[PDB]
Amino acid sequence: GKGDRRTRRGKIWRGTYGKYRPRK
Amino acid sequence: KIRIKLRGFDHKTLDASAQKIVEAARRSGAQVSGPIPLPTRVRRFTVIRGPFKHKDSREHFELRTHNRLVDIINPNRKTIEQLMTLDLPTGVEIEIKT
Amino acid sequence: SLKKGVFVDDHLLEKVLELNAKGEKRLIKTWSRRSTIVPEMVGHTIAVYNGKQHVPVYITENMVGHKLGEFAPTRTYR
Amino acid sequence: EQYYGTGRRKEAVARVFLRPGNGKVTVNGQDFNEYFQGLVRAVAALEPLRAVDALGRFDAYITVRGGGKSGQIDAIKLGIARALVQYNPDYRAKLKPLGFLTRDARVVERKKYGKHKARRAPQYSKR
Amino acid sequence: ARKALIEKAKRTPKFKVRAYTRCVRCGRARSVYRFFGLCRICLRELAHKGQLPGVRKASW
Amino acid sequence: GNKIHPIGFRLGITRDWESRWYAGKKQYRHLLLEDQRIRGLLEKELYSAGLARVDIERAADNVAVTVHVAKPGVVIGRGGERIRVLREELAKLTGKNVALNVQEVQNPNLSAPLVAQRVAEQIERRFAVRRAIKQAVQRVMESGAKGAKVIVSGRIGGAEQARTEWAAQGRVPLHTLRANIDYGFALARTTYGVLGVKAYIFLGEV
RNA sequence: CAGGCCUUGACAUGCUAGGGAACCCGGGUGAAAGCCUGGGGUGCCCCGCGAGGGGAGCCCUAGCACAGGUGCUGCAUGGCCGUCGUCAGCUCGUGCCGUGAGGUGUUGGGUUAAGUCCCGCAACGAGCGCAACCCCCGCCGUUAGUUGCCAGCGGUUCGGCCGGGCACUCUAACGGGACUGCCCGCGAAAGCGGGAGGAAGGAGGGGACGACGUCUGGUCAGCAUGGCCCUUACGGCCUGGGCGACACACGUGCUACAAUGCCCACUACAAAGCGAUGCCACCCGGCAACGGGGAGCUAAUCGCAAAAAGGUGGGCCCAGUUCGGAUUGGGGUCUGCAACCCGACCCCAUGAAGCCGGAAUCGCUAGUAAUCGCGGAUCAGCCAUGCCGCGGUGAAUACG
Ligand SMILES: [Mg+2]
Ligand SMILES: [Mg+2]
Ligand SMILES: [Mg+2]
Ligand SMILES: [Mg+2]
Ligand SMILES: [Mg+2]
Ligand SMILES: [Mg+2]
Ligand SMILES: [Mg+2]
Ligand SMILES: [Mg+2]
Ligand SMILES: [Mg+2]
Ligand SMILES: [Mg+2]
Ligand SMILES: [Mg+2]
Ligand SMILES: [Mg+2]
Ligand SMILES: [Mg+2]
Ligand SMILES: [Mg+2]
Ligand SMILES: [Mg+2]
Ligand SMILES: [Mg+2]
Ligand SMILES: [Mg+2]
Ligand SMILES: [Mg+2]
Ligand SMILES: [Mg+2]
Ligand SMILES: [Mg+2]
Ligand SMILES: [Mg+2]
Ligand SMILES: [Mg+2]
Ligand SMILES: [Mg+2]
Ligand SMILES: [Mg+2]
Ligand SMILES: [Mg+2]
Ligand SMILES: [Mg+2]
Ligand SMILES: [Mg+2]
Ligand SMILES: [Mg+2]
Ligand SMILES: [Mg+2]
Ligand SMILES: [Mg+2]
Ligand SMILES: [Mg+2]
Ligand SMILES: [Mg+2]
Ligand SMILES: [Mg+2]
Ligand SMILES: [Mg+2]
Ligand SMILES: [Mg+2]
Ligand SMILES: [Mg+2]
Ligand SMILES: [Zn+2]
């Protein structure tokens, strides 16, 4: 859910990028 | 070749001051590209009417920054006299390049 | 969190290092609850400020990578 | 030769072109049924041709830009009509009767201050 | 203590961190702008007079 | 409390910016502050003239500083030795080559910003307020006009109970844009408090 | 708030006095503030070979007059904002009735969103409101073309990239359009219901606009301001603490309790804004946050940038689970002098309550509700799930 940092959504919602949502 | 910018605020003036720089840019030789109206950048900002606590019914304004472009094809020594010395911008601003 | 420095204020070590001279007494006050604990600074009980007074806090290896602040309670009724 | 109609519908501008022939349909550089794969509303944009009856006749070449895929399908459904309405002074009998002409003025409205969503008003305590 | 502040704010010698804003007209620290240099209160005020160039009662 | 500011309202059309020029985000807060401290000084040492506006224009280093007034007698000076010292002042802070135009008032009884000040004065001078209004109003019609409305705040007459004085004649379509209504506000610093005055001069229609 | 310090003061104005007078570089003690102290010597007005002597700004000391106070009073006030409510209302001039307070007008008949209009009438008119005058989305058009397009023929290293073109699209500036002028039905009128043409009717749909007054409404802490009160402190600086406390109650919120679902790889369609020690392409380092290099941009011509939901196929299998991410441990990064109180991200490990919520109660009539992603202000950083905006997908129902 929009509340799990270790998730695509979570990361997205948080407005961040990372290992679960890298910059391409 | 020479490019010219036209910012300012009241699009009522800027339009004229610009348009002038064509009816007078053709008489000085080379042809020109009609006053081209590029997009407008806007400055909107909201404020809470009351001077205290009333997050509702507040009020926001705008600050329309009109821009306008136009350009002469060939740089005549003729035109130069006009442009360079015909500085008549009430509240206008102009940038020139190549 | 500091990985290139240690932000540990100088008027500390300064007063700790000069004290390092053969190692004498210890009673030493400060308001740097914001600095870090330096290794070997054990035995040097440093009364820390909290806004009210200076807590006569001992200091030992167990506690090091910490701030003298963690050791000072800011509020009351813990 | 070229048969164009201005496709526009809710922040969606579609460019419609009609070339007699097969029936192939293109949009922004792709096969119609491919650029809209999944959308069961795709086959809806071509519905105008299906009542003029004249489908196996115009290799339509479109290019819609701006908006949402579905919105685009709307822009298109208007171009395919506005385009062919031109090259058929009699095909007016459908763009007016079979309601195929309206920009749908229907569009998102400004979010008023003090209304989470331009209308949805915040909660309420009272107590 | 709002006088000594406006001045204290002007001075800057200490750590750029503490360099903070404050309304130009009224000694107000809250809701200022990186543009105008006015506070919501002030801004809207001038705004209504016209002393704010190109600024217009927004409409869309 | 509501009612918009007939100025900022009309702003767009009818009434134009009391300060008109341009500048980018880099420097704009500056040319405003300036434009402000300018008017700031002018409203001070020049009041004895009763100025009802201070347009200001620019371009680059140049400054309009145009001052409208009703009694220029004190603007220029004796033969011309007053304004001369003012250009100095305006420059004494403005590191620019500021000019300084000036005009008059074809009738102060049609210059709200004045009707106000005039009234604002009377009160401050213990005059009777009802009259000072019922009167200051007529004075605006007698001198040709279509709209005049004056308003005074509370404390009228040192009354511990702050009231409010209303008074107007003719028509005043405050909501109508094709109105061209001059709006003016003046203070009053009576030993027993403070007063406020609203001036509404509905002039030419359309 | 505790503690360490300063007094014509952190700032305005004026005056008196020997010195020195502009300014720049330090040192000592200290937590900082502060206090104490050691070093070059000056364009100016001018008698004058010169030394030197008088001296106008500005500054330092001393003293005098004064500053300053978010201290009290929003029932002493200005200003501005909130509310009844954009509700259809409130009044005025004169005439007339009435002992008078006050009526009439503005009661009545039809109509309307409307004190909108009409017709009536001891009333005849009028003003502030209503409407209209203003901006936006709409239809179409003219001017203008470095956005745009095999649109047309074109060369093209195979991208509107190059030549080249205003036709599209678009950008932005000026216009036409819609006015109950047509037809039928009802009527004394105003005007109601029906219908065609039209992009749009009978105010076309949203903005801006909120009467006399009301709540002794709100705010003296934005500002202004009368009165009151403080002056080596009710003023001023500083370091540290606090506003972030927590057995608890409420308000508004966010994430959820799952297969109309969640996860993972791939692949699309936006709008609106924003950017100079600023947004970062593109590289190399790292699992990553981010870091070393470094192109372009004064920004319809580079960047923020990726829209997300969607579409494809792949994995879970009804389990407190691959549902849900609280809690905490360990390892890090960035802004900043400085993250103990007290920042935001990252990664590993922890995986809490929750399987749809009592009594109650809220929002919403259509591009609305619901749902998904995006921009901006403030701003070093950020506790923003807030607010103010943008667009994508896109309903249910209205007997009464
Ligand atoms: Mg999960
Ligand atoms: Mg939406
Ligand atoms: Mg509320
Ligand atoms: Mg204090
Ligand atoms: Mg800060
Ligand atoms: Mg007295
Ligand atoms: Mg002093
Ligand atoms: Mg008040
Ligand atoms: Mg009281
Ligand atoms: Mg009467
Ligand atoms: Mg009588
Ligand atoms: Mg009467
Ligand atoms: Mg009326
Ligand atoms: Mg009839
Ligand atoms: Mg309208
Ligand atoms: Mg009260
Ligand atoms: Mg005050
Ligand atoms: Mg502190
Ligand atoms: Mg704190
Ligand atoms: Mg708080
Ligand atoms: Mg806390
Ligand atoms: Mg794409
Ligand atoms: Mg945006
Ligand atoms: Mg943009
Ligand atoms: Mg590479
Ligand atoms: Mg770098
Ligand atoms: Mg770099
Ligand atoms: Mg966690
Ligand atoms: Mg439920
Ligand atoms: Mg139940
Ligand atoms: Mg019940
Ligand atoms: Mg509704
Ligand atoms: Mg956001
Ligand atoms: Mg920020
Ligand atoms: Mg937090
Ligand atoms: Mg919030
Ligand atoms: Zn302010």
Side-chain angles (χ1 to χ4, degrees), chain B residues 3 5 11 15 33-44 46 49-52 54 57-60 66 68-69 71 97:
Chain B
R3 197 142 50 180
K5 303 284 188 175
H11 65 290
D15 194 66
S33 55
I36 60 177
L38 67 176
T40 314
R41 284 285 281 276
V42 179
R43 261 295 190 57
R44 293 183 184 180
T46 307
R49 296 202 183 187
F52 194 38
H54 291 287
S57 84
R58 44 176 128 188
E59 165 177 282
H60 41 190
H66 299 81
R68 189 165 303 326
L69 197 72
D71 286 325
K97 285 300 177 183

Side-chain angles (χ1 to χ4, degrees), chain C residues 1-19:
Chain C
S1 300
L2 278 281
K3 63 308 303 179
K4 270 78 81 63
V6 190
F7 65 111
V8 49
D9 288 0
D10 293 296
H11 40 292
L12 285 291
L13 298 65
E14 180 180 299
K15 214 64 181 180
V16 176
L17 307 175
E18 91 160 4
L19 215 306

Side-chain angles (χ1 to χ4, degrees), chain B:
Chain B
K1 299 180 175 60
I2 295 180
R3 197 142 50 180
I4 48 89
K5 303 284 188 175
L6 296 83
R7 297 175 294 187
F9 287 146
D10 266 6
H11 65 290
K12 195 169 298 180
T13 70
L14 189 284
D15 194 66
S17 67
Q19 186 179 62
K20 186 295 303 173
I21 313 177
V22 185
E23 302 179 62
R26 295 183 176 300
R27 171 178 57 66
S28 57
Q31 300 183 302
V32 180
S33 55
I36 60 177
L38 67 176
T40 314
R41 284 285 281 276
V42 179
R43 261 295 190 57
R44 293 183 184 180
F45 43 70
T46 307
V47 163
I48 341 300
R49 296 202 183 187
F52 194 38
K53 297 154 181 165
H54 291 287
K55 270 288 169 308
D56 311 306
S57 84
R58 44 176 128 188
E59 165 177 282
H60 41 190
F61 314 108
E62 56 182 57
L63 175 76
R64 292 185 174 183
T65 287
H66 299 81
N67 272 300
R68 189 165 303 326
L69 197 72
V70 184
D71 286 325
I72 63 289
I73 52 175
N74 185 57
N76 311 298
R77 285 295 184 299
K78 174 54 59 291
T79 70
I80 305 308
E81 189 173 2
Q82 280 60 62
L83 302 187
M84 190 63 91
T85 73
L86 195 58
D87 299 301
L88 195 62
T90 170
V92 189
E93 177 71 358
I94 59 294
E95 302 305 301
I96 303 73
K97 285 300 177 183
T98 50

